[PDB]
Amino acid sequence: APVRSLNCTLRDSQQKSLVMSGPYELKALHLQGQDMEQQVVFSMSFVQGEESNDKIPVALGLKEKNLYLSCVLGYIDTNDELYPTLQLESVDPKNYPKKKMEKRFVFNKIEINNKLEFESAQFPNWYISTSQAENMPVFLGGTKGGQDITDFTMQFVSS
């Protein structure tokens, strides 16, 4: 393209790591030592979308997996109308990433020090979220304050 990118892991504000849960899902849990190898490496690209002084548009791919997080209307857990849902979408490595990511792939990275939130650019007020419980899916949530975990820290891996 080229697109500006870095590789990183993410941990939620409770220190849970993100790992694969089947081929098309992530889950969060507190990890230990060598098992840390299980945490998922993201490739965070900076996309040409709507930048605020503190709303930096990004896409999140899963390094080496040809998968991207995307926000698409569907049905939600519940714990006719459609709601934003988090999907792990496989893509043609030939064309991704790109500065012009389709809207479903774009998150606004919000830096509330020293924490990051990732808001769906397509569906405002919906965030990459984890449950307080161990081993539950990563999902789009956080629409009501103080209910879900929507804060993360980033661990730089490489560029």
How many C-beta neighbours within 10 Å does residue 90 have? 13
Of 37, 7, 42, the closest CA to residue 26 belongs to 42
CATH topology of domain 1-159: Trefoil (Acidic Fibroblast Growth Factor, subunit A) (2.80.10)
Report helix, strand or coil for 24. coil
> What residue spans define the domains of the chain?
1-159
- Amino acid letter, residue 31: L
| Residue-by-residue DSSP string for 62-104 | ETTTTEEEEEEEE--------EEEEEEEE--TTT-S-SS--GG
Token pair 């405002």 in the structure block, residue: 124
Of 131, 155, 153, the closest CA to residue 141 belongs to 131
Alpha carbon 56 to chain centroid, angstroms: 14
Please list, in sequence order, all residues whose beta carbon lies within 8 angstroms of the beta carbon of residue 3, skipping any fewer than 6 positions away: 45, 46, 47, 97, 98, 99
Measured in Å, how far apart are the chain's first and last C-alpha atoms?
16
Task: Report d(CA 1, CA 47) in Å as an integer.
Answer: 11
Resolution (A): 1.7
Do residues 17 and 9 touch, judged by C-beta distance below 8 A? Answer: yes
- Amino acid letter, residue 153: T
The answer to whether the Cα torsion of 15, 17, 21, 26 is positive or negative is: positive
Task: Report d(CA 84, CA 141) in Å as an integer.
Answer: 8
Instruction: Supply 15's token pair.
Output: 């220190």
Instruction: Supply 141's token pair.
Output: 């949530």
Task: Report d(CA 112, CA 99) in Å as an integer.
Answer: 25
Task: Report d(CA 108, CA 58) in Å as an integer.
Answer: 6
